[PDB]
């Protein structure tokens, strides 16, 4: 019924996943993500998650409804953030210390919230995202972010030791894939493995953002991770060669060591990028560290 009352106004995004539209519902802007045929299973997983797990959180994209509307389409209706994604926003502006730390702390807060199981009737299972990237993190006008696109999410309950992986043909974006995914050594039956996959990807987003924080009048152009060492649309084997075989990691600009904030974020992101997954920081530790900077 939400879908029948929505007026679609403007397409604001298009990809292999489908399309995103700005719509109006009860006079308020809403985001309508219209899934492609190729990605119907992500719609299904996200719908199941939003209808069975209490997820609401400042830094998780707000859910309104899911619907199959009648031509038949699969729609996921959420709050609308006119700044669009971090990918979009980082390309039209540079950041200062305050706005950079607000972005990265808000992502760490949302990720910690996903990862941590909460006991009881007001609680939730532990959740790992598995495809975190700058294109599915939204920026609010108040400068905080929120994480979207839970179609690959996996859940875990420590009490019963049940791991719910989805059976989704989709895999994570290859440019952001962790070493253990690329060399197929990931322990697929351990929930902690998916959390560590998230932490790797977070480190890459951290790098993407920090580059855009000005210090002493200097800033880097926006670039996606590994822009300098793999082609656009890199293959799985392109990524395995660079990340696993050659052990490359995004370069830290020297100008960052003149700013205390960027020096601290540089230390943080390198501790997300250990080849050994169990050596990476946890989301909560990142959150704590960023609350102190
Ligand atoms: C008319 C263009 O306008 C700009 C723009 C771009 C996007 C949005 C926008 C996207 C979303 C959203 N999505 C659904 C959840 N996601 C995913 O699943 C990603 C695919 C994996 C993220 C996208 C949800 C909620 N809100 N939302 C707003 N809004 C505005 C594009 C560029 N311009 C420039 C020209 C100035 C500015 C804004």
From Swiss-Prot:
GO CC term, one of those recorded: plasma membrane
Q: Which ranges does the record list as Cytoplasmic topological domains?
A: 1-293
MF annotations from Gene Ontology = activin binding; activin receptor activity, type I; ATP binding; BMP receptor activity; cadherin binding; metal ion binding; peptide hormone binding; protein homodimerization activity
Membrane topology, from the record: Single-pass type I membrane protein
Q: Name one GO biological process term.
A: positive regulation of intracellular signal transduction
Enzyme Commission numbers on file: 2.7.11.30
Query: What does the entry state regarding organ or tissue expression?
Result: Expressed in normal parenchymal cells, endothelial cells, fibroblasts and tumor-derived epithelial cells.
Binding-site residues, ATP = 12-20, 33
Which EC class is the enzyme in? transferase
* Catalytic reaction annotation: L-threonyl-[receptor-protein] + ATP = O-phospho-L-threonyl-[receptor-protein] + ADP + H(+); L-seryl-[receptor-protein] + ATP = O-phospho-L-seryl-[receptor-protein] + ADP + H(+)
Sorted keywords for this record are: ATP-binding, Disease variant, Glycoprotein, Kinase, Magnesium, Manganese, Membrane, Metal-binding, Nucleotide-binding, Phosphoprotein, Receptor, Serine/threonine-protein kinase, Signal, Transferase, Transmembrane, Transmembrane helix
Every Protein kinase domain range: 6-293
Q: Which cofactor does it need?
A: Mg(2+); Mn(2+)
Q: Which family does it belong to?
A: Belongs to the protein kinase superfamily. TKL Ser/Thr protein kinase family. TGFB receptor subfamily.
What does this protein's UniProt record list under function? Bone morphogenetic protein (BMP) type I receptor that is involved in a wide variety of biological processes, including bone, heart, cartilage, nervous, and reproductive system development and regulation. As a type I receptor, forms heterotetrameric receptor complexes with the type II receptors AMHR2, ACVR2A or ACVR2B. Upon binding of ligands such as BMP7 or GDF2/BMP9 to the heteromeric complexes, type II receptors transphosphorylate ACVR1 intracellular domain. In turn, ACVR1 kinase domain is activated and subsequently phosphorylates SMAD1/5/8 proteins that transduce the signal.
**Pathology linked to this chain's protein:** Fibrodysplasia ossificans progressiva: A rare autosomal dominant connective tissue disorder resulting in skeletal malformations and progressive extraskeletal ossification. Heterotopic ossification begins in childhood and can be induced by trauma or may occur without warning. Bone formation is episodic and progressive, leading to a debilitating ankylosis of all major joints of the axial and appendicular skeleton, rendering movement impossible.
Protein name (record): Activin receptor type-1
Q: List the source organism.
A: Homo sapiens (Human)
Gene that encodes the chain: ACVR1
The shown chain, on whole-protein numbering, covers 203 to 498 of 509
């Amino acid at each position: 019924t939400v879908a029948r009352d929505i007026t679609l106004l403007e397409c604001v995004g298009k990809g292999r996943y489908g399309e995103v539209w700005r719509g109006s519902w009860q006079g308020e802007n809403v985001a309508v993500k219209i899934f492609s045929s190729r990605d119907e299973k992500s719609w299904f997983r996200e719908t199941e998650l939003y209808n069975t797990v209490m997820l609401r959180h400042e830094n998780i994209l707000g859910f309104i409804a899911s619907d199959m509307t009648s031509s038949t389409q699969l729609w996921l209706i959420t709050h609308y953030h006119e700044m669009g994604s971090l990918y979009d926003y980082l390309q039209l502006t540079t950041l200062d210390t305050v706005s950079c730390l607000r972005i990265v702390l808000s992502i760490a807060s949302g990720l910690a919230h996903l990862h941590i199981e909460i006991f009881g009737t007001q609680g939730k299972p532990a959740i790992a995202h598995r495809d975190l990237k700058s294109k599915n993190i939204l920026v609010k006008k108040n400068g905080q972010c929120c994480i979207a696109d839970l179609g690959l999410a996996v859940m875990h309950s420590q009490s019963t030791n049940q791991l719910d992986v989805g059976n989704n043909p989709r895999v994570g974006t290859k440019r952001y894939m962790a070493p253990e995914v690329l060399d197929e050594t990931i322990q697929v039956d351990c929930f902690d493995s998916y959390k560590r996959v998230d932490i790797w990807a977070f480190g890459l987003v951290l790098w993407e953002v920090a580059r855009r924080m000005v210090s002493n009048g200097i800033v880097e152009d926006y670039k996606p991770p590994f822009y300098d060492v793999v082609p656009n649309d890199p293959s799985f084997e392109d990524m395995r060669k660079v990340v696993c075989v050659d052990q490359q990691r995004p370069n830290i600009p020297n100008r960052w060591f003149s700013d205390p904030t960027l020096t601290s974020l540089a230390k943080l992101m390198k501790e997300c990028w250990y080849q050994n997954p169990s050596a990476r920081l946890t989301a909560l530790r990142i959150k704590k560290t960023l609350t102190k900077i």
